[PDB]
Amino acid sequence: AFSSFN
Amino acid sequence: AFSSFN
Amino acid sequence: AFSSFN
Amino acid sequence: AFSSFN
Amino acid sequence: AFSSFN
Amino acid sequence: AFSSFN
Amino acid sequence: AFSSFN
Amino acid sequence: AFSSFN
Amino acid sequence: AFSSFN
Amino acid sequence: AFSSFN
Amino acid sequence: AFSSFN
Amino acid sequence: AFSSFN
């Protein structure tokens, strides 16, 4: 999985 | 932020 | 599982 | 916060 | 299980 | 708060 | 102000 | 999370 | 994320 | 201002 | 990403 | 100004 987020 | 993980 | 939360 | 976990 | 709570 | 638990 | 948070 | 603020 | 600003 | 963030 | 600015 | 970014 991967993610980009604040 | 960013994360790659299993 | 993953979560991003306050 | 963020958490990756089983 | 997972919980996030105040 | 948060927790991961069985 | 006040807050809580994870 | 929770906050009181102006 | 959370932000309060003017 | 104030912020909570990852 | 996020930003507050004039 | 404020910014949070990768």
List the chains bordering chain F where 3 or more Cβ pairs fall under 8 Å. D, E
C-alpha dihedral (B5, C5, A6, H6), degrees to nearest 10 = -170
Chains B and A touch (3+ CB pairs under 8 A): yes
* CA D1 – CA H3 distance, rounded (Å): 16
Instruction: Give residue for tokens 């809580």.
Output: G4
Helix (H, G, I), strand (E, B) or coil at K3: strand
Kindly state whether B5 is in contact with chain C, defined as any CB-CB distance less than 8 angstroms: yes
In whole angstroms, what is the distance from residue I3 CA to residue A1 CA?
A: 27
The data reach a resolution, in angstroms, of 0.8
What distance in Å separates the CA atoms of residue K1 and residue J4, rounded to the nearest whole number?
Answer: 13
Tokens of A5: 């987020």
Bridge-based pairing of strands L2-4 and I2-4 is unpaired
Chain J residues with CB-CB distance to L4 below 8 A: 3, 5
Q: Decide: A6 and B6 in contact? Cβ < 8 Å.
A: no
CB C4 within 8 Å of CB E4: no
Q: Please tell me if residue C4 touches chain E, with a CB cutoff of 8 Å.
A: no
- Which one-letter amino acid corresponds to residue L1? A
Could you give the 3-state DSSP secondary structure of residue J2? strand
